[PDB]
């Protein structure tokens, strides 16, 4: 069971996340943290050319199965 999405960096690295349509962007960043050790404040997620906000869900953004999110880290 379950829905998968992809998260792709500019490095080219791509990872598969296990998600639900009801997942908030907050929980998605937490899943990236679990896999890669990157805290959410160092994550910028982009889909359809827009920066995603933490309180909205994948379904809110029309992110569906096998969609690709773009991850660019926020290093300052």
């Amino acid at each position: 069971g379950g829905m998968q999405i992809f998260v792709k960096t500019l490095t080219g690295k791509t990872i598969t996340l296990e998600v639900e349509p009801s997942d908030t962007i907050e929980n998605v960043k937490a899943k990236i943290q679990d896999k890669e050790g990157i805290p959410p404040d160092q994550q910028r997620l982009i889909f359809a050319g827009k920066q995603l906000e933490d309180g909205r869900t994948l379904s809110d953004y029309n992110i569906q199965k096998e969609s690709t999110l773009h991850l660019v880290l926020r290093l300052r």
Partner: protein, 230 residues
């Protein structure tokens, strides 16, 4: 309570297994576009040991494959015991020999990744043929004496078995405890496994999760189907 948003992690940690399981069966189901009525922190109160364990997620969910039936077997046994090719061969043989499906139609079934999926009967036949391991199965809520105590009804049903496989058949997605940053819910139409260690601690293993998590048996949603090796 009536409103669970006041329960603290500490209160939940002091609860019995049956009290924790009642929180799961009452509040852990996600809504259609939002999480359940239990937070990550509250669910973390249901975790027992966070110490190093030799038990691991041997099989993570692979990209594009609905093969949790295989993953749960391998996680239950803590080995790469059932390969993909044998998983798919044994499955196809069932449709071929028992359901009269042609070779061409069986191959379409195996190869259509989005439409693929098996059930507890296929699982039982795989376990019998490949490993000579009989099983019994029951919904947790149908177990003898479950109404009196979910924890003990499940313990008594499992007996001395070292592993169990769990099928979430139905429409509900359950938030579950996780020893990590994210919530990894038990999604609908999906297999997971649990493995018992030497201290009789049970470790919950979702191929879609990040790490094993030590939870009481009563944490398993009561509508789920338990498969128990005999």
């Amino acid at each position: 309570p009536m409103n669970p948003q006041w329960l603290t992690e500490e209160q939940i940690k002091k609860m019995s297994p049956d009290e924790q399981g009642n929180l799961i069966d009452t509040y852990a189901a996600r809504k259609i576009n939002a999480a359940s009525d239990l937070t990550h922190a509250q669910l973390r109160g249901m975790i027992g040991s966070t110490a190093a364990s030799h038990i691991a997620i041997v099989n993570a969910q692979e990209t594009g494959l609905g093969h949790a039936g295989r993953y749960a077997i391998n996680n239950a046994l803590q080995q790469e015991a059932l390969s993909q090719n044998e998983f798919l061969s044994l499955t196809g043989q069932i449709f071929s020999n028992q359901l009269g499906m042609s070779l061409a139609d069986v191959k379409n079934l195996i190869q259509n990744q989005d439409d693929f999926g098996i059930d507890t009967g296929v699982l039982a036949q795989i376990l019998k043929q490949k490993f000579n391991q009989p099983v019994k199965e029951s919904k947790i809520c149908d177990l003898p004496d479950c109404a009196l105590s979910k924890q003990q009804a499940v313990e008594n049903y499992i007996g001395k078995a070292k592993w169990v496989i769990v099928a979430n058949i139905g429409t509900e997605v359950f938030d579950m405890p996780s020893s990590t940053h994210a919530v990894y819910p038990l999604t609908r139409g999906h297999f997971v496994a649990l493995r018992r260690d030497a201290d009789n601690r049970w470790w919950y293993l979702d191929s879609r999760g990040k790490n094993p998590v030590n939870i009481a048996l009563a944490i398993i949603p009561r509508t789920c189907t338990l498969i128990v090796p005999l």
